[model samples]
Target: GSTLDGPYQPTTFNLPIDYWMLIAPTQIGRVAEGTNTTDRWFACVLVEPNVQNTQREYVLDGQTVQLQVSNNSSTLWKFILFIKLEKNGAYSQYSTLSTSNKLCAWMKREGRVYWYAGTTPNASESYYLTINNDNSNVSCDAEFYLIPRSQTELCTQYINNGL
Candidate 1:
């Protein structure tokens, strides 16, 4: 009953890029048929850059980033997302539209460093992530894009190619 489409060959751009953070909730707590169970959720940072005649290196120090969730799922779900800056071992909570927070706060607070998220969203919704600064952290970074099992076949090529 999901109607999301993609596997649209995600392209990478230089640092200081705009990306989306998508989150999909799986059943976690008590399951009373419809008790708003918060199980497993996927979260990924996506960015569509010009990829033209631009050559620059950007870094993301541990800083807070803004994120938006576009609920494309037939059903509504709640999620709690966070990011970890491996260098300082700093963790950040994703800032939602309801909150007026900056992106990559950790980077600003600590320093430029490598960061990664626990969740990887592939389907059910569309999300966005905005980074504030560009340091070595953002320069050498890799994102993990996730797709639901039901829709995994759509992105088989990318997955198969080891993207």
Candidate 2:
């Protein structure tokens, strides 16, 4: 059903998006996580990425995922990325701050099916991020990793239904 409507018959020019998968992790920019997960929260402006969607999920690959953020400097935010780590069927979450930029970032916890973003460690986001018209500090960004997913091995997870 890959038809072309250019007054010409459609040709099967479907190309594979292997390079995108071949790509390593990336960081567009950096921003703070938050002050204390209550009064302060880094804004989660964008969760863009350069990965292609499943066969019929959303759409295909693009240039790259942008990590845009900012802070008032008064917020005392730390540039970071929150992650949900799983080991031996047990999971614990944590944040990866950009202040030091950890080199070994790929998950090795017996291979976890994951998700992540920026703003309040980005892993366990500050409840502050849940509010709209949230005219707080109003600036934040960060360089981050892989896309979110439903499950990878054995029907598993989403960043919900847990603490």
Candidate 3:
């Protein structure tokens, strides 16, 4: 198990480690069309520590977390996307996977296409992302992934407990 820095820190104690399964475009339950080819596309996933629905103190401390993104829109939504970490209810740093425009470009060169991958290398934290789009569509079947730190025993327990 990993030792977190704060006693109040939100830990993934019992939450299932789920990656990008699938997100129904309609169930994402909202939509905004781009005004231009380079309009901004934004989507966010709220991650909480374990199964505690009332707590929101998860933050990234440089640990490995999984990130998966998919394009399910019938129309393609071209944009740069990145994951950000938050601590004590504040924004930390954007995860390394989507740091620079050049990095995002390189990711695009790979087949990652809609799916983005990266790791949180420091602490146990909560994360989210915003999709910046250009001439594309955020389809109905677009999906993303989030896996907890793999080497931690706590993460393994969380997974075993169906978190």
Candidate 4:
């Protein structure tokens, strides 16, 4: 029996962040009339992950997810956006986001809703998620945050509101 045994070594690597979470939107009523064919937007946020207490529950405003729009212009389509949990690093586009090949979960976010995308082994300010603009042609100067959804339900309260 020929044997070539190499030295045995064990290493301990501590994981940085626990996990990544997402906030996506759910549709409610019909699409707005007389607008661009696309350009829908959704809200999202970056939060710490908890195994014992996961944030996978839905926070709905009636039949749809309540989110803040970029503006009151008619050119706006539905609230359409993309949010992926990644290292808090720099990125300009979707392709740039997935390049490093770091572990991630692609998701959408809005309102008080929460979701579990996945986890990563990276650490510190190196991890980040981007708030993408629906128009790929332009760069977004704004960052998104998690906020409370109004107690009123859209499906029920949208009657008198002209918005």
Candidate number achieving the greatest TM-score relative to the actual structure: 1
Candidate 2 vs 4: which has more lDDT? 2
- Expressed as tens digits, the lDDT of each residue in 19-77 for candidate 2 is 10001123333222221223222211212333232211111011123332333333322
Root-mean-square deviation of every model: 17.8, 18.8, 17.8, 22.6
- Candidate 4 per-residue lDDT, tens place, 50-153, comes to 12322232222112333222222222112222322333321111211111111112222221112222111111122233333322221111211222223122
What's each prediction's TM-score? 0.22, 0.19, 0.19, 0.17
Q: How many residue pairs clash in each candidate?
A: 32, 15, 33, 16
For lDDT, candidate 1 versus 4, the one ahead is 1
What TM-score does model 3 achieve against the real structure? 0.19
**Clashes (candidate 3):** 33
**Model 3, C-alpha of 106: deviation from truth (Å):** 19
Shift in Å, residue 85, candidate 3: 3.2
lDDT of 4 at 12: 15
- The model with the greater lDDT, 2 or 3, is 3
lDDT tens string, model 3, 52-159? 223222212222334343333232232223323232122222332211111111111111223333322211223333333222233222222233234234433222
